[PDB]
Symmetry: C3
C-alpha cells in the first residue's frame, strides 16, 4: 500500500495510499499541508453511493516519503500518473482539493483523458493564484506569499496552529469543527516535510494553470465556499468555471476553505449529484 | 515488524507487532479504539517475570493496515491465527482486553486449544454485550449502541476525546490518569481507521460469544474492575466467569475500564499469579 | 529522502533521511526525541553545499523499538553500520546531548578514517554523572532516579514536564511556542518506553573521558550558557579542555534545545567550523 514513484539518491520515494470499496474510481487529492486523512467525511458517502475511493498522501505529507526535491507540479503530476498506472485505473474521477486542483489541471494537460471520465475542483487553486504586475487579476501577492514562507521557516508548528484555525473558519464563524478535530489536523500537518511544506507554497501560489484548463473537455464540477479565506472563490473556482465550457458550480453558502469537513452534507450532495450524472 | 494476513483491493493487509523477551509466550490483545501501546504497564513486568510478550495492533488500529473490510470477529480471529502461525507460537497465553476478549473467545472456538495454555479476559466484552428484553444481561442497549455509532460518524475526534475521559474514570473519580496520558491515548485512537472504528462498535456489541465460551477447558482468568463504566463487570466478566466454571476472578476495587493502566500493580499481580504453574 | 538501514526474528532498522549533495554532516539527536529535532539546521546546511543525514536512534522516531541494545556499545555499532552502508567519507558528526556519546565512542572504537570533524552540541560528555568521587558531573543520583521513576510510573506526564524545561533558559520560558513544545512531546510520546528508560542510565552513567583522549581531529563544542539539563560547566567546558585544538561556541541565553531557540547562532557556529 505504497506506490514507488521514483528514487532520490537511489532510495525509493514511496506514496502512501488507501483504496476502499468497489465501483468506478474516485481519486481524492488533498490540500496543503494535510494528507489523505482529510477526506474522512467523503469516503463513506462515496463508497455507499457505489464508488471505489482512492486517497493518497502527496510526497512529503502524511505517511508518504519525505524527499528533498520534487515539490513542483511536473513531479507531483508524475506521481499521480504512477498511481493511476500502477492501480490500472479507468473511468476515473479526479477530485482536487486546494493545491490538489493543480495535479488535476496538469494531469489532463500532460497525460490526457484516456483514464479520466470526470473531474472536480474543490476549493482549488487554479487557474493561477499569484497576483503580480503581469497577472494583476490574481489573489496572492508577493508580500502575502512571503508571510507564509517566513512562518514555515521561522516557526512552522505555531504557523500551522494558526493556519488550521483559519482553514475551517468562515468569516466570524469559528465553531464549524471541534477543537479536537482542529488539533487532529494540526498534528497531520506537523509531521510533514518541512522542505516540502515550504516548497509547496511556491508551487500552489505561483504555478499558472491557465494553459492547462484549455485541454478540459470532459465533465467538470467546481465545489467552493463563498467564505474561503485562503483560496477566494472569486479568484479561483469562479474563474476555473468560466475557463471550462459546460462545467458546473456548487457555491456553498458560508463554506470556508475546509468545506469538505465543515459542510460535508452539502459538499457530498453536490459531488454525488455530479457523479451519478 | 509486520505480518501479512490478507489482501483487499490488490494490496496486502499488514499487522504490526512487537515481540519482546524470552520464555512462555503471552499475547496481549488491545481494546477499542487503541493499539498495542496500551500495554505499556504490563510488558516490562511480564518480561521481567520470564515471559515472552507479543503485542499487536488490530487491523485498522495503531500501526497496522487500514483496509475497508474485515472488521468482524471471524477476520479478526483469522488475523490472530496468522500471527500465531507466523511466529510459530506454542504454549501461548492469550490476554484479551475489552473487545480483545472476543478474539480470545473465538480463537478457542474456531482453532481449538492445541497452541494455548491459559487465557485471560480483562475488562472484556464476552459473553455477549448486547442488551435487550430477551437478553437482559447484556451491557449495551440499542440506544447506547446508536450513540456510539452516531458519535463516530458525525465527529469522531470529539467523541474520542470524551470516550477517553470515561475510559479511565471510576464513577466520579477522574484523576486516575494524567491529562498527558489521556491525550496520548486520544491521539492513538485518532489515527485509527474511521471505518474500522465504526464497524468495531457493531462487532463488539452485537457478537454473541456464549457458544464459544462453552469450549473453554483451559485455565481462565477474569480480571475486571468493579467500576467499569463501558463494560460493567455484572454484564460481562461476572457472566464469563459463570460461563467457564474453571475460571478465577480478580475483581479490582475502584477499577475503571482502563484498569491495566490505573491499577497496573493489582492487574499485573493477578496476571503473574495466574501465569505461574 | 528517507530510507531504512538494516542494523528475535525481525531485523532492527534505523530510519534516516538523506538530503542534498556534498560532504556529509550526520546529525545525532538527543533524548527522547528524533531526527526531526534538527528542523532548523537541515536547510542552512544543504544551502551551504553539504549533504545532511539525520537518523533516529533505535527506540525513537521512526526506527525499530527492540527490547535491548539501549547502551553505547550498540548505539555506536548502529551508527557505524549506517556510515558503512552509506559509504560516507569526510563526515562531520554532530552529536546533540546524548548523541555526543555516539560521537565520543565512535572515534574511540572505530577511529577517524571516515570522519573529518566532530561537533559536541549541548552534549553529555565527558561524564555526566555527578558523585562524591566525580564532582565535575552534572546529574546526581537523586536526579537520575527522578527520571527513572518518572518514566516507569507516568512517562507521558514526565515528558510533558521535561519538554517545558528543555527549551527554557532560566526565566526565559517563551523561547519556543507551545505548539512547538507539544510537537516535541508527541515525538517523545511514541518512543519505546523501554528505550526511553534505559537511555537514562546510558547517558547519565557512561564515562567517555578515556574516549576523548583519542580525539585528534578538528572539534567544535556548541553549548548554551543556560542549559538546565546539561550545564556547560560540567560538560562542554570539560570536553573542550579534553580535546586539543578544539573550538568553543558558547551561546548566550542558550537553553538545552538551543538548536531551535537560537538556530541562527547555532547555525553560524556550525557553518564557520565546517568550512575551516
Ligand atoms: Cl493547498
Ligand atoms: Cl473495546
Ligand atoms: Cl540526551
Ligand atoms: Na502521530
Ligand atoms: Na494447553
Amino acid at each position: 500500500a505504497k506506490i514507488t514513484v521514483g528514487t532520490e539518491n537511489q532510495a525509493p520515494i514511496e506514496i502512501y495510499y488507501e483504496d476502499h470499496g468497489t465501483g468506478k474510481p474516485v481519486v481524492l487529492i488533498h490540500g496543503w499541508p494535510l494528507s489523505g486523512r482529510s477526506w474522512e467525511y467523503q469516503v463513506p458517502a462515496l463508497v455507499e453511493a457505489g464508488y471505489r475511493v482512492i486517497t493518497y498522501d502527496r510526497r512529503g505529507f502524511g505517511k508518504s516519503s519525505q524527499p528533498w526535491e520534487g515539490y513542483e507540479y511536473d513531479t507531483f503530476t508524475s506521481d499521480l500518473h504512477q498511481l493511476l498506472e500502477q492501480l490500472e485505473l479507468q473511468n476515473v474521477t479526479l477530485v482536487g482539493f486546494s493545491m490538489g486542483g493543480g495535479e488535476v489541471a496538469r494531469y489532463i494537460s500532460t497525460y490526457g483523458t484516456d483514464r479520466i471520465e470526470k473531474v472536480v475542483f474543490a476549493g482549488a487553486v487554479p487557474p493561477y493564484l499569484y497576483k503580480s504586475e503581469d497577472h494583476p487579476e490574481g489573489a496572492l501577492d508577493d508580500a502575502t506569499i512571503e508571510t507564509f514562507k517566513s512562518g514555515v521557516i521561522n516557526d512552522r508548528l505555531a504557523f500551522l496552529d494558526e493556519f488550521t484555525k483559519g482553514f475551517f473558519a468562515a468569516g466570524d464563524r469559528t465553531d464549524l469543527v471541534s477543537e479536537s478535530f482542529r488539533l487532529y489536523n494540526w498534528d497531520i500537518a506537523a509531521g510533514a516535510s518541512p522542505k516540502g511544506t515550504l516548497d509547496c507554497i511556491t508551487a500552489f501560489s505561483k504555478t499558472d494553470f491557465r494553459k492547462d484548463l484549455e485541454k478540459f473537455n470532459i465533465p467538470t464540477l467546481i465545489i467552493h465556499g463563498d467564505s474561503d479565506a485562503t483560496v477566494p472563490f472569486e479568484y479561483s473556482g469562479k474563474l476555473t468555471h468560466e475557463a471550462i465550457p459546460n462545467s458546473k458550480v456548487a457555491l456553498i453558502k458560508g463554506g470556508p476553505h475546509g468545506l469538505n469537513a465543515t459542510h460535508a452534507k452539502e459538499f457530498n450532495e453536490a459531488l454525488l449529484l455530479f457523479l451519478k450524472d
